[PDB]
Amino acid sequence: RGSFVEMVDNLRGKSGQGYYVEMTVGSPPQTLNILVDTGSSNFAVGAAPHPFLHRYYQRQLSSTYRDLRKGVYVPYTQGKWEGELGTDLVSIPHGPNVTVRANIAAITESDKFFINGSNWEGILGLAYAEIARPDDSLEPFFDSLVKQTHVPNLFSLQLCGAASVGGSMIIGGIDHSLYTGSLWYTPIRREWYYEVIIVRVEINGQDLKMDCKEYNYDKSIVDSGTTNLRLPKKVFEAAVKSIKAASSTEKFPDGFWLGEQLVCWQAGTTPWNIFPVISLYLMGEVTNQSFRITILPQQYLRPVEDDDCYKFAISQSSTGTVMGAVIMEGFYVVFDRARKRIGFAVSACHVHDEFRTAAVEGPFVTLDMEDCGYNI
Numbered sequence: 118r119g120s121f122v123e124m125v126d127n128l129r130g131k132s133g134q135g136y137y138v139e140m141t142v143g144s145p146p147q148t149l150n151i152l153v154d155t156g157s158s159n160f161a162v163g164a165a166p167h168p169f170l171h172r173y174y175q176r177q178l179s180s181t182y183r184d185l186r187k188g189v190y191v192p193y194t195q196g197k198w199e200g201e202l203g204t205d206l207v208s209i210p211h212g213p214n215v216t217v218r219a220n221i222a223a224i225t226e227s228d229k230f231f232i233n234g235s236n237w238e239g240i241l242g243l244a245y246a247e248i249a250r251p252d253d254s255l256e257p258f259f260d261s262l263v264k265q266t267h268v269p270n271l272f273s274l275q276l277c278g279a280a281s282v283g284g285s286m287i288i289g290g291i292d293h294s295l296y297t298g299s300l301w302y303t304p305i306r307r308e309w310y311y312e313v314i315i316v317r318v319e320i321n322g323q324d325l326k327m328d329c330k331e332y333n334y335d336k337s338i339v340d341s342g343t344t345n346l347r348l349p350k351k352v353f354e355a356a357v358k359s360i361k362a363a364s365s366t367e368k369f370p371d372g373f374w375l376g377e378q379l380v381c382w383q384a385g386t387t388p389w390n391i392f393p394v395i396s397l398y399l400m401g402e403v404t405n406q407s408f409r410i411t412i413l414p415q416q417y418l419r420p421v422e423d424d425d426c427y428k429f430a431i432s433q434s435s436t437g438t439v440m441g442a443v444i445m446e447g448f449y450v451v452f453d454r455a456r457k458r459i460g461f462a463v464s465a466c467h468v469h470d471e472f473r474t475a476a477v478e479g480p481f482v483t484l485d486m487e488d489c490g491y492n493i
């Protein structure tokens with residue numbers, strides 16, 4: 118506990134393509150790069166020679182492969198994958214010194230799922246069984262890991278932003294070299310997604326003053342498998358209005374705020390100072406107690422290489438708040454499953470300037486925080 122040198126820097130990727138970890142599957146071990154995804158619950162790997170794929174799982178080569186004789190069909194908002202369920206032996210080379218028998222969905226057909234030019238061949242769904250396909254009886258990888266080994270029921274993520282990105286997934290613990298200051302914990306409201314409650318939103322310390330239920334309509338989640346900070350429609354328009362007001366030193370086309378246009382500045386002359394900070398107050402551990410996380414334009418204006426051009430990476434949502442890479446790149450994030458809570462601390466690797474840094478601050482007095490959660 119406290120130091121996991123072998124797991125530091127075990128994540129790689131490209132901007133906009135996500136963060137992957139090296140895994141092995143089968144006997145003998147077949148090496149695959151696997152997207153780290155806290156917003157889903159399936160371990161699903163390429164099993165057929167799709168042209169975008171560097172590598173794929175070849176079940177015929179594995180002596181420890183067991184066919185579950187069951188299909189799985191996963192349409193989602195932005196694509197589709199389908200596969201054949203099985204089990205096999207799985208290890209993480211730059212993770213704990215263990216081997217686990219895990220459920221594997223062998224992907225046999227997909228659409229808009231694999232990224233052309235990416236270096237990953239599968240997805241590690243790190244959320245809970247309730248959202249696993251086809252149903253909650255398919256035990257997620259991390260559940261299998263904890264059940265079969267002495268690995269503590271905790272993992273933590275340091276996602277380091279920017280073409281190449283990196284970071285750390287500490288499996289079974291916390292590495293104190295990855296953050297500065299203190300960890301502040303928010304309750305996991307329900308174990309399906311990593312669902313949290315946002316109690317207050319500020320743009321440059323100016324409260325949006327919305328009914329806090331709007332912030333979590335219909336949920337708020339922490340998702341390493343999403344790029345943007347996604348906000349419910351009503352919250353998004355309030356936030357953009359305020360961000361526009363604060364940044365009115367320079368005028369931008371309306372399309373930029375909708376992510377339909379890039380904005381460019383002469384190399385290394387990006388006016389970070391004109392753009393406001395964004396604070397999300399999260400439900401704390403104690404009644405009437407909250408803390409806030411604060412991100413910079415360096416997090417929400419993402420570099421696009423095609424002199425210095427940027428995409429606005431805050432976007433409107435109909436699925437509730439999604440705290441994607443935009444949020445997570447500011448913070449060391451502790452998924453403390455054992456204690457049903459998520460910890461946030463200022464990341465040792467977050468992108469900032471000489472004037473401002475990302476911040477995790479508390480405690481604050483916030484009443485009626487339970488009222489902020491949405492119920493069907």
Ligand SMILES: C[C@]1(c2cc(NC(=O)c3cnc(OCF)cn3)ccc2F)N=C(N)SC[C@@H]1c1ccccc1
Nearest residue numbers: 132133134135154156157193230340341342343344442
């Ligand atoms: C499995 C799923 C998913 C995610 C991605 N992610 C990415 O490509 C990506 C790109 N850049 C990032 O940061 C910047 F570097 C982060 N991630 C790609 C394909 C996918 F199918 N995970 C989700 N959380 S959202 C939809 C989907 C999903 C979720 C739930 C149920 C089914 C499918």
